[PDB]
């Protein structure tokens, strides 16, 4: 029903709601996968309740009753999304040994810089993929000037920052 988008009627207009702690990640590894699945939708409905109230707070020109418990629901939702990933990323190491969930290759686009190419799903193989074959993954010889100029820009940026650190660190032995 639609009353789950708001808290109890004994909590409308209180400016302090006594809430517990956010779940930390250690408590959630001890729960099972059917028992974290249901904790997601309890945390999903408590998040959706707070997101209406934060919108009705801004609409009524009023401060929130307690915005610190939306910090406690986001930091406990991601803690649940961390423990699902920690079993998905470990079960793939035992079954297939791959460290990433999506396939991909290190390629080098037209501008010569090395990029990670995350793969996409297709129904036809790549040599008859008309759009894919236009996207070209190599650098021609005219790029090597700009690769040397980009390299010297980061070498100037790093030689500026490392030199500025020592210039601040000898000032420390002048005041102290």
């Amino acid at each position: 029903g639609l009353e789950e988008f708001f808290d109890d009627p004994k909590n409308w207009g209180q400016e302090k709601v006594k809430s517990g702690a956010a779940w930390t990640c250690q408590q959630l590894r001890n729960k099972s996968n059917e028992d974290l699945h249901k904790l997601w939708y309890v945390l999903l409905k408590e998040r959706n309740m707070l997101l209406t109230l934060e919108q009705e707070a801004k609409r009524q020109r009023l401060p929130m009753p307690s915005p610190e418990r939306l910090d406690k629901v986001v930091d406990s939702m991601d803690a649940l999304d961390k423990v699902v990933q920690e079993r998905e990323d470990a079960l793939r190491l035992l079954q297939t040994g791959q460290e990433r969930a999506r396939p991909g290759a290190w390629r080098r686009d037209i501008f010569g810089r090395i990029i990670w190419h995350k793969f996409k799903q297709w129904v036809i193989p790549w040599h008859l993929n008309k759009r894919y074959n236009r996207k070209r993954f190599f650098a021609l010889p005219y790029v090597d000037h700009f690769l040397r100029l980009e390299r010297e820009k980061r070498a100037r940026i790093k030689a500026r920052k490392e030199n500025l650190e020592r210039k601040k660190a000898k000032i420390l032995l002048k005041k102290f």
Binding site: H145, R148, L149, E152, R156
Partner: protein, 97 residues
């Protein structure tokens, strides 16, 4: 009216700093160390002008021939332009011939 309304923070200066107290040591390392070293093997600076003095056209021509292979690309192009300018200035322009 660019003159300061307060007098500037004081200049303390450490005359018996380690750099100042030992300034000059081993400047005479050749003439009383059996000439195993020259005093110009004490000078520490850019690799192209150690023990060598010249004007700006002699300096950029020497910096290019010694360190131009590993100079940065937009910094090298300024050097070739500068040599091409100081060639034209020192060889074509001036009051005296």
């Amino acid at each position: 009216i660019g003159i300061r309304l307060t007098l500037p923070p004081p200049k303390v200066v450490d005359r018996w700093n380690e750099k100042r107290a030992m300034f000059g040591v081993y400047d005479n390392i050749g003439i009383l160390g059996n000439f195993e070293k020259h005093p110009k093997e004490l000078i520490r600076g850019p690799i192209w002008l150690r023990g060598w003095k010249g004007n700006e056209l002699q300096r950029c021509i020497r910096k290019r021939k010694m360190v131009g292979s590993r100079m940065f690309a937009d910094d090298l192009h300024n050097l070739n332009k500068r040599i091409r300018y100081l060639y034209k200035h020192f060889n074509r322009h001036g009051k005296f011939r």
